[PDB]
Symmetry: C2
Subunit: 123 residues, 2 copies
Protein backbone atom coordinates (compact mmCIF):
# COMPACT_ATOMS: atom_id res chain seq x y z
CA UNK A 1 0.00 0.00 0.00
CA UNK A 2 2.86 2.38 -0.80
CA UNK A 3 2.09 5.26 -3.14
CA UNK A 4 2.89 4.18 -6.70
CA UNK A 5 4.28 6.35 -9.51
CA UNK A 6 2.71 4.94 -12.66
CA UNK A 7 5.20 6.53 -15.08
CA UNK A 8 8.42 6.32 -13.04
CA UNK A 9 9.66 3.01 -14.46
CA UNK A 10 9.32 4.06 -18.10
CA UNK A 11 10.71 7.52 -17.36
CA UNK A 12 13.84 5.84 -15.99
CA UNK A 13 14.26 3.70 -19.11
CA UNK A 14 13.81 6.83 -21.23
CA UNK A 15 16.55 8.66 -19.32
CA UNK A 16 18.79 5.58 -19.48
CA UNK A 17 18.41 5.54 -23.26
CA UNK A 18 19.32 9.24 -23.29
CA UNK A 19 22.47 8.47 -21.30
CA UNK A 20 23.28 5.82 -23.91
CA UNK A 21 22.59 8.26 -26.75
CA UNK A 22 25.10 10.68 -25.22
CA UNK A 23 27.51 7.86 -24.23
CA UNK A 24 27.41 8.73 -20.52
CA UNK A 25 28.74 6.08 -18.12
CA UNK A 26 28.43 3.26 -20.64
CA UNK A 27 30.82 0.53 -19.57
CA UNK A 28 30.90 -2.11 -22.33
CA UNK A 29 31.22 -2.43 -26.11
CA UNK A 30 29.25 -5.24 -27.76
CA UNK A 31 30.94 -6.40 -30.97
CA UNK A 32 28.67 -8.12 -33.50
CA UNK A 33 30.66 -9.21 -36.56
CA UNK A 34 31.84 -5.76 -37.67
CA UNK A 35 29.42 -3.52 -35.76
CA UNK A 36 29.95 -2.12 -32.27
CA UNK A 37 27.22 -1.25 -29.76
CA UNK A 38 27.97 0.59 -26.53
CA UNK A 39 25.63 0.05 -23.58
CA UNK A 40 25.30 -0.19 -19.81
CA UNK A 41 26.06 -3.61 -18.34
CA UNK A 42 23.23 -3.25 -15.82
CA UNK A 43 20.58 -2.78 -18.52
CA UNK A 44 22.12 -5.60 -20.55
CA UNK A 45 21.84 -8.22 -17.80
CA UNK A 46 18.40 -7.00 -16.67
CA UNK A 47 17.03 -7.89 -20.14
CA UNK A 48 19.13 -10.77 -21.51
CA UNK A 49 19.76 -14.17 -19.94
CA UNK A 50 23.10 -14.47 -21.74
CA UNK A 51 24.44 -11.10 -20.58
CA UNK A 52 23.14 -11.99 -17.12
CA UNK A 53 25.20 -15.18 -16.98
CA UNK A 54 28.27 -13.31 -18.26
CA UNK A 55 28.28 -10.40 -15.83
CA UNK A 56 26.97 -12.36 -12.84
CA UNK A 57 30.35 -14.14 -12.91
CA UNK A 58 32.86 -12.08 -10.93
CA UNK A 59 35.59 -13.23 -13.34
CA UNK A 60 33.88 -11.66 -16.36
CA UNK A 61 32.14 -8.75 -14.63
CA UNK A 62 34.88 -6.22 -15.48
CA UNK A 63 35.07 -6.93 -19.23
CA UNK A 64 34.64 -3.84 -21.40
CA UNK A 65 34.30 -5.74 -24.70
CA UNK A 66 32.03 -8.68 -25.54
CA UNK A 67 32.36 -10.51 -28.86
CA UNK A 68 29.09 -12.17 -29.77
CA UNK A 69 28.98 -15.26 -31.95
CA UNK A 70 29.91 -14.67 -35.62
CA UNK A 71 26.55 -16.09 -36.71
CA UNK A 72 24.61 -13.33 -34.93
CA UNK A 73 22.95 -10.78 -37.23
CA UNK A 74 24.11 -7.24 -36.33
CA UNK A 75 20.80 -5.65 -37.33
CA UNK A 76 18.93 -8.19 -35.21
CA UNK A 77 21.00 -7.30 -32.16
CA UNK A 78 20.46 -3.62 -32.91
CA UNK A 79 16.69 -4.16 -32.86
CA UNK A 80 16.83 -6.11 -29.59
CA UNK A 81 19.20 -3.61 -27.96
CA UNK A 82 16.89 -0.71 -28.76
CA UNK A 83 14.02 -2.78 -27.37
CA UNK A 84 15.91 -3.11 -24.07
CA UNK A 85 16.00 0.69 -23.76
CA UNK A 86 12.48 1.49 -25.04
CA UNK A 87 10.07 -1.47 -24.42
CA UNK A 88 9.22 -1.22 -28.15
CA UNK A 89 10.07 -4.17 -30.42
CA UNK A 90 10.11 -3.64 -34.20
CA UNK A 91 9.10 -6.93 -35.85
CA UNK A 92 8.91 -6.83 -39.65
CA UNK A 93 8.28 -9.53 -42.24
CA UNK A 94 11.88 -8.96 -43.37
CA UNK A 95 13.57 -9.07 -39.95
CA UNK A 96 11.46 -11.54 -37.92
CA UNK A 97 13.84 -14.41 -38.70
CA UNK A 98 17.01 -12.56 -37.70
CA UNK A 99 15.41 -10.96 -34.63
CA UNK A 100 14.07 -14.27 -33.31
CA UNK A 101 17.38 -16.07 -33.77
CA UNK A 102 19.15 -13.22 -31.98
CA UNK A 103 16.57 -13.28 -29.18
CA UNK A 104 17.07 -17.00 -28.49
CA UNK A 105 20.85 -16.47 -28.43
CA UNK A 106 20.47 -13.54 -26.01
CA UNK A 107 17.96 -15.64 -24.01
CA UNK A 108 15.03 -13.19 -24.03
CA UNK A 109 12.25 -15.74 -23.58
CA UNK A 110 9.40 -13.21 -23.68
CA UNK A 111 10.67 -11.67 -26.92
CA UNK A 112 11.01 -15.19 -28.33
CA UNK A 113 7.36 -15.93 -27.47
CA UNK A 114 6.26 -12.70 -29.15
CA UNK A 115 8.27 -13.58 -32.25
CA UNK A 116 6.34 -16.86 -32.48
CA UNK A 117 2.98 -15.06 -32.22
CA UNK A 118 4.13 -12.78 -35.04
CA UNK A 119 5.12 -15.84 -37.10
CA UNK A 120 1.85 -17.64 -36.39
CA UNK A 121 -0.10 -14.49 -37.29
CA UNK A 122 1.63 -14.28 -40.69
CA UNK A 123 1.34 -17.88 -41.97
CA UNK B 1 3.70 0.36 -35.44
CA UNK B 2 6.20 -1.33 -33.14
CA UNK B 3 5.14 -3.91 -30.56
CA UNK B 4 4.91 -2.36 -27.08
CA UNK B 5 5.88 -4.42 -24.02
CA UNK B 6 3.75 -2.81 -21.31
CA UNK B 7 5.52 -4.59 -18.43
CA UNK B 8 9.08 -4.32 -19.79
CA UNK B 9 10.23 -1.03 -18.24
CA UNK B 10 8.88 -2.17 -14.86
CA UNK B 11 10.54 -5.61 -15.11
CA UNK B 12 13.87 -3.95 -15.99
CA UNK B 13 13.67 -1.72 -12.91
CA UNK B 14 12.86 -4.78 -10.79
CA UNK B 15 15.94 -6.61 -12.06
CA UNK B 16 18.07 -3.51 -11.46
CA UNK B 17 16.92 -3.50 -7.83
CA UNK B 18 17.77 -7.20 -7.53
CA UNK B 19 21.28 -6.34 -8.71
CA UNK B 20 21.39 -3.63 -6.03
CA UNK B 21 20.27 -6.16 -3.41
CA UNK B 22 23.15 -8.48 -4.35
CA UNK B 23 25.63 -5.60 -4.93
CA UNK B 24 26.25 -6.57 -8.56
CA UNK B 25 27.93 -3.73 -10.50
CA UNK B 26 27.18 -1.09 -7.88
CA UNK B 27 29.65 1.68 -8.69
CA UNK B 28 29.13 4.45 -6.10
CA UNK B 29 28.74 4.78 -2.34
CA UNK B 30 26.38 7.55 -1.24
CA UNK B 31 27.12 8.64 2.34
CA UNK B 32 24.48 10.40 4.45
CA UNK B 33 25.45 11.26 8.01
CA UNK B 34 27.55 8.14 8.56
CA UNK B 35 25.37 5.62 6.69
CA UNK B 36 26.61 4.25 3.36
CA UNK B 37 24.25 3.46 0.47
CA UNK B 38 25.50 1.47 -2.53
CA UNK B 39 23.85 2.21 -5.87
CA UNK B 40 24.25 2.34 -9.64
CA UNK B 41 25.12 5.83 -10.87
CA UNK B 42 22.96 5.51 -13.99
CA UNK B 43 19.86 4.79 -11.90
CA UNK B 44 20.69 7.78 -9.69
CA UNK B 45 21.20 10.18 -12.61
CA UNK B 46 17.95 9.02 -14.21
CA UNK B 47 15.95 9.76 -11.03
CA UNK B 48 17.69 12.78 -9.46
CA UNK B 49 18.57 16.19 -10.82
CA UNK B 50 21.28 16.41 -8.17
CA UNK B 51 22.93 13.10 -9.06
CA UNK B 52 22.51 14.05 -12.72
CA UNK B 53 24.46 17.29 -12.29
CA UNK B 54 27.07 15.55 -10.13
CA UNK B 55 27.91 12.66 -12.44
CA UNK B 56 27.60 14.72 -15.63
CA UNK B 57 30.52 16.76 -14.25
CA UNK B 58 33.77 15.28 -15.60
CA UNK B 59 35.46 16.18 -12.30
CA UNK B 60 33.13 13.94 -10.26
CA UNK B 61 31.88 11.55 -12.97
CA UNK B 62 33.99 8.58 -11.81
CA UNK B 63 34.30 9.26 -8.06
CA UNK B 64 33.69 6.24 -5.84
CA UNK B 65 32.16 8.10 -2.88
CA UNK B 66 29.74 11.04 -2.82
CA UNK B 67 29.04 12.70 0.53
CA UNK B 68 25.71 14.49 0.83
CA UNK B 69 24.98 17.53 2.96
CA UNK B 70 24.90 16.32 6.60
CA UNK B 71 21.56 18.11 7.01
CA UNK B 72 19.95 15.28 5.02
CA UNK B 73 18.10 12.54 6.90
CA UNK B 74 19.39 8.99 6.21
CA UNK B 75 16.05 7.24 6.72
CA UNK B 76 14.51 9.81 4.38
CA UNK B 77 17.17 9.28 1.71
CA UNK B 78 16.76 5.51 2.09
CA UNK B 79 13.08 6.07 1.22
CA UNK B 80 13.94 8.08 -1.90
CA UNK B 81 16.57 5.55 -2.99
CA UNK B 82 14.05 2.72 -2.56
CA UNK B 83 11.53 4.71 -4.62
CA UNK B 84 14.16 5.11 -7.35
CA UNK B 85 14.54 1.34 -7.77
CA UNK B 86 10.84 0.47 -7.28
CA UNK B 87 8.51 3.41 -8.25
CA UNK B 88 6.93 3.04 -4.77
CA UNK B 89 7.25 5.74 -2.10
CA UNK B 90 6.82 4.83 1.58
CA UNK B 91 5.14 8.15 2.29
CA UNK B 92 3.78 8.41 5.85
CA UNK B 93 2.61 11.11 8.24
CA UNK B 94 5.77 10.65 10.31
CA UNK B 95 8.18 10.99 7.39
CA UNK B 96 6.56 13.15 4.68
CA UNK B 97 8.35 16.32 5.80
CA UNK B 98 11.69 14.50 5.81
CA UNK B 99 10.89 12.82 2.48
CA UNK B 100 9.85 16.09 0.81
CA UNK B 101 12.92 17.96 2.07
CA UNK B 102 15.23 15.19 0.87
CA UNK B 103 13.36 15.16 -2.45
CA UNK B 104 13.97 18.89 -2.90
CA UNK B 105 17.68 18.38 -2.17
CA UNK B 106 18.04 15.54 -4.68
CA UNK B 107 16.12 17.72 -7.20
CA UNK B 108 13.28 15.23 -7.67
CA UNK B 109 10.51 17.58 -8.75
CA UNK B 110 7.71 15.02 -9.16
CA UNK B 111 8.18 13.59 -5.67
CA UNK B 112 8.10 17.11 -4.22
CA UNK B 113 4.86 17.89 -6.07
CA UNK B 114 3.21 14.73 -4.74
CA UNK B 115 4.40 15.52 -1.21
CA UNK B 116 2.87 19.01 -1.29
CA UNK B 117 -0.46 17.60 -2.50
CA UNK B 118 -0.73 15.37 0.58
CA UNK B 119 0.31 18.21 2.89
CA UNK B 120 -2.22 20.61 1.32
CA UNK B 121 -4.88 17.90 1.68
CA UNK B 122 -4.20 17.80 5.45
S1 LIG C 1 19.01 -9.20 -13.07
C1 LIG C 1 18.25 -10.46 -13.62
N1 LIG C 1 17.53 -11.13 -12.69
C2 LIG C 1 16.70 -12.33 -12.81
C3 LIG C 1 17.05 -13.27 -11.66
C4 LIG C 1 16.96 -14.55 -12.17
C5 LIG C 1 18.09 -15.16 -12.71
C6 LIG C 1 18.00 -16.45 -13.24
C7 LIG C 1 16.77 -17.11 -13.23
C8 LIG C 1 15.64 -16.49 -12.70
C9 LIG C 1 15.74 -15.21 -12.17
N2 LIG C 1 18.40 -10.68 -14.96
C10 LIG C 1 17.93 -11.66 -15.76
C11 LIG C 1 18.26 -13.01 -15.58
C12 LIG C 1 17.79 -13.98 -16.46
C13 LIG C 1 17.01 -13.63 -17.56
N3 LIG C 1 16.70 -12.28 -17.77
C14 LIG C 1 17.18 -11.31 -16.88
S1 LIG D 1 19.11 11.49 -17.49
C1 LIG D 1 18.28 12.75 -16.81
N1 LIG D 1 17.60 13.60 -17.60
C2 LIG D 1 17.56 13.46 -19.07
C3 LIG D 1 17.97 14.77 -19.77
C4 LIG D 1 17.47 15.88 -19.08
C5 LIG D 1 18.35 16.80 -18.50
C6 LIG D 1 17.87 17.90 -17.81
C7 LIG D 1 16.49 18.11 -17.69
C8 LIG D 1 15.61 17.20 -18.27
C9 LIG D 1 16.10 16.09 -18.96
N2 LIG D 1 18.31 12.89 -15.47
C10 LIG D 1 17.66 13.89 -14.85
C11 LIG D 1 17.99 15.22 -15.08
C12 LIG D 1 17.31 16.24 -14.43
C13 LIG D 1 16.30 15.94 -13.52
N3 LIG D 1 15.97 14.60 -13.28
C14 LIG D 1 16.66 13.58 -13.94
Amino acid sequence: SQIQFTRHASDVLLNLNRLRSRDILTDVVIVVSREQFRAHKTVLMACSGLFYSIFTDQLKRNLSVINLDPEINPEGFNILLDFMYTSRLNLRVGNIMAVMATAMYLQMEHVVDTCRKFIKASE
